Amino acid sequence: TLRAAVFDLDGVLALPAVFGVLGRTEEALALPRGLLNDAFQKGGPEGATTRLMKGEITLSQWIPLMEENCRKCSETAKVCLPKNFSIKEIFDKAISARKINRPMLQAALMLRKKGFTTAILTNTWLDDRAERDGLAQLMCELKMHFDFLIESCQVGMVKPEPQIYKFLLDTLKASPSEVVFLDDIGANLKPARDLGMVTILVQDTDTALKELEKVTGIQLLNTPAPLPTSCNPSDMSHGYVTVKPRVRLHFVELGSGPAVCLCHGFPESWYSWRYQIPALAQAGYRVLAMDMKGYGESSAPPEIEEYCMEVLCKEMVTFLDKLGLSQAVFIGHDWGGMLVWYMALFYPERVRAVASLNTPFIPANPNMSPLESIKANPVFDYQLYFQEPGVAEAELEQNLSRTFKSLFRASDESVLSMHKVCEAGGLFVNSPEEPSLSRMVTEEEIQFYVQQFKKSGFRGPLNWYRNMERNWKWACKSLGRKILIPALMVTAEKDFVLVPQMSQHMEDWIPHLKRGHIEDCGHWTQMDKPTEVNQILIKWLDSDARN
């Protein structure tokens, strides 16, 4: 029966309720009970606060008016107000103190994930305070999680006025019968209840969620920790920068703050950071998730040398140049990780900080040739299979869906053996024709990769493996250097190709290297342990890259 849930902001999606700062201030100030509240509702429908809530005047215009009210209220009450009594001071602190009620938001998200039309109905104001950004960021984060956001000051109506509930119903495209409305102010529930829609008087969150869980018949409480926010491609800002006549790089951008450049591995895409893009943006950074040369909407020239590390890094430098960025924090995974270590070794000036997931920084061996070194590692056999131009391309391109379903698997869902590849004569030789769906990815996400790779195939992507000799000679130019800028290395316990122990010596080249380690995490780190990754990166960014 129910199809939509509407949540109030103050006291429901955000706490502590700003409206509740009036009472707390009275006790603290030994003022008569309810004094500040009376001054707040002085005049009712025709009072300053209602005009404020309807958008007739701004918050800064309202402040002086609320002040006179407090005086007039203390006058009939025969009481004085402290000398440093400041309404601006009072609300500034209350507003900034108000945080998102995560469990309430989580419940909204769940209901929405299960087909519910969600909305926010709140009496609010046009905030033009010097500190408005705080409220802006909070609304910015909530907004994306709901189908609709109905703000009183925006629609000229305010609860309890029944007209706004009709507006709600019309916006929702649902009859009262199929709508549950949560509010902490009983008065606001009556109008909704009269229309016949379900209502929940929200005092304490748990109780409120128990009623909500009961009435909707969906688990909302004591539910498992959910996956972080994953962005939708069509809702992202897409950027394109031509770094060379035939080479254009594509990236998705979100957030403000220090620039953080994400560099995916093989055979992935910017979408491989879908879980950290919103998280890092949310943490105060300007995220630039790349489509590395050879992938997605980025150019994919056929020439092998177009993908040697030196060229790839120059291009990323040019990328910063064209965007007018003197630096960016570089965070890479797999092949992208190799690239950031080198960005730091050859262009320290442009790297604010560097971080790699799984991919350890290993210096070139002045003596042993790349081919030799690689043959000395059974698990790296597959890299030899990628050498001959065209072969690997045919196998990986034959059935894209199969390709990504076979590759993108958790540590214990494996179906491939990177060690017996050349021997087997292929990468999927003894792999299912129709692999099951990895717990890490949905059928939709798999198809996103599928469509991205239909554009350029695996030639460009595979070419990254075809410059061993060139990359070796280039890297040798840096054997005398050291990475002295902030650096983070995150190892993945169950990554059987890029094993943790491979990074054990890194300290010799990065003295102040900081670390991170994720257990029971395979090679596809971002997808596997998104929550751990975000927490590790954000912690690191806030302490070493933000300064």
Ligand X SMILES: O=C(O)CCCNC(=O)NC1CCCCC1
Active site members: 334, 465, 523
Residue 418 touching ligand X (CB under 6 A): yes
Element (H, E) at 182: strand 179-183
Ranges within 385-414 binding ligand X (CB under 6 A): 407
Query: What are the E-state strand segments in 20-129?
Result: 99-100, 117-122
CA triple 271-534-330, angle to 5 deg: 70
Interacting partner of 266 out of a copy of itself, Mg ion, ligand X, none (Cβ under 5 to 8 A depending on kind)? ligand X
Token duo for residue 217: 């018949």
123 is in an annotated binding site: yes
Binds a copy of itself (CB under 8 A): choice among 304, 325, 371, 415: 325
Residue 334 interacting with ligand X (CB under 6 A): yes
Verify binding: residue 477, a copy of itself, rule CB under 8 A.
Answer: yes
Q: Binding site annotation covers 508?
A: no
Least distance (Å) from Mg ion to the CB of residue 173? 24
Q: Is 385 annotated as a binding residue?
A: no
- Tokens describing residue 437: 């769906």
Q: Which of residues 176-205 bind Mg ion (CB under 5 A)?
A: 184
Size of the site for ligand X (CB under 6 A): 11
Burial of 50: CB neighbours in 10 Å, binned 0-12, 13-18, 19+: middle
Would you give the DSSP letter of residue 32?
Answer: P
Binds 367: which of a copy of itself, Mg ion, ligand X, none (CB < 5-8 Å by kind):
none
Going by C-beta distance under 8 Å and a sequence separation of 6 or more, which residues neighbour residue 126? 55, 58, 59, 153
CA distance 325 to 243: 14
Q: Is 528 part of any known ligand binding site? A: no
Site string for ligand X, 487-516 (x = CB under 6 A): ----------xx------------------
Q: How far is CA 461 from its chain centroid?
A: 26
Q: Which does 348 bind (CB under 5 to 8 A by kind): Mg ion, ligand X, a copy of itself, none?
A: a copy of itself
Contact 50, 153 (CB under 8 A): no
State the residue for tokens 């751990």: 532
| CA–CA–CA angle 353, 358, 364 (5° rounding) | 80
Distances (CA, A) of 27 to 70, 343, 515: 15, 58, 48
- Judged by beta carbon, residue 98 or residue 523, the one nearer ligand X is 523
In angstroms, the CA 387 to CA 384 distance is 5
Binding window for a copy of itself (CB under 8 A); candidates: 28-36, 39-47, 238-246, 379-387: 238-246
Report d(CA 482, CA 488) in Å as an integer: 14
* Residue 32, token pair as written in the block: 């008569």
Q: How many of the chain's residues bind Mg ion (CB under 5 A)?
A: 4
Single-letter code of the amino acid located at 476: C
Region 134-173 residues binding ligand X, contact defined as CB under 6 A: none
What is the footprint of Mg ion within residues 422-481 (CB under 5 A)? none
Give yes or no for residue 542 binding a copy of itself (CB under 8 A): no
309 binds a copy of itself (CB under 8 A): no
Candidates 335, 385, 509, 540: give the one binding ligand X (CB under 6 A). Answer: 335
Of 66 and 120, the one with the shorter C-beta distance to Mg ion is 120
Q: Which does 324 bind (CB under 5 to 8 A by kind): ligand X, a copy of itself, Mg ion, none?
A: a copy of itself
Q: Which residue has the tokens 């050349």?
A: 422
**Residue 104 interacts with a copy of itself (CB under 8 A)?**
no
According to the binding rule CB under 8 A, does residue 56 interact with a copy of itself? yes
Query: Is 147 labeled as ligand-binding?
Result: no
With contacts defined by CB under 5 A, name the span among 6-14, 108-116, 149-157, 327-335 that binds Mg ion.
Answer: 6-14
Distance CA 347, CA 342 (A): 8
CA 167 from centre of chain: 32
Q: What is the DSSP string of 444-509?
A: HHHHHHHHHHHHHTTHHHHHTTS-HHHHHHHHHTTTT----S-EEEEEETT-SSS-GGGGTTGGGT
Cβ atoms of 277 and 287 closer than 8 Å: yes
Q: Which stretch binds ligand X (CB under 6 A): 18-26, 236-244, 318-326, 334-342?
A: 334-342
Take residue 278 and report the two structure tokens written for it: 């919103």
258-287: which residues touch ligand X (CB under 6 A)? Answer: 266
The single residue among 359, 431, 467, 526 that binds ligand X, judged by CB under 6 A, is 359
Which residue pairs, CB below 8 angstroms and at least 24 apart, start in 132-135?
A: 134/95, 134/96, 135/95
Q: Minimal distance in Å, beta carbon 525 to ligand X?
A: 10
From the list a copy of itself, ligand X, Mg ion, none, partner contacted by residue 418 (C-beta under 5 to 8 A by kind) = ligand X
Shortest distance in whole angstroms from residue 277 CB to ligand X:
22
11 belongs to the binding site for Mg ion (CB under 5 A):
yes
To the question of whether residue 165 is assigned a binding role by annotation, the answer is no
Tell me whether residue 8 or residue 445 sits nearer to Mg ion (CB atom).
Answer: 8
469/304 Cα distance (integer angstroms): 12
User: Segment near Mg ion (CB under 5 A), from 9-17, 54-62, 101-109, 206-214?
Assistant: 9-17
Q: Are 507 and 480 in contact (CB under 8 A)?
A: no
Which residues are at the interface with ligand X (CB under 6 A)?
Answer: 266, 334-335, 338, 359, 407, 416, 418, 497-498, 523
Which residues does the annotation place in the binding site for Mg(2+)?
A: 8, 10, 184
Which residues are at the interface with Mg ion (CB under 5 A)?
Answer: 8, 10-11, 184
Which residues does the annotation place in the binding site?
A: 8, 10, 122-123, 184, 382
Which residues are at the interface with a copy of itself (CB under 8 A)?
Answer: 51, 55-58, 60-61, 126-128, 132-133, 135-137, 139-140, 143-144, 154, 156, 234-242, 253-256, 259, 278, 281-282, 286-287, 320-327, 346-350, 352, 477-478, 480-485
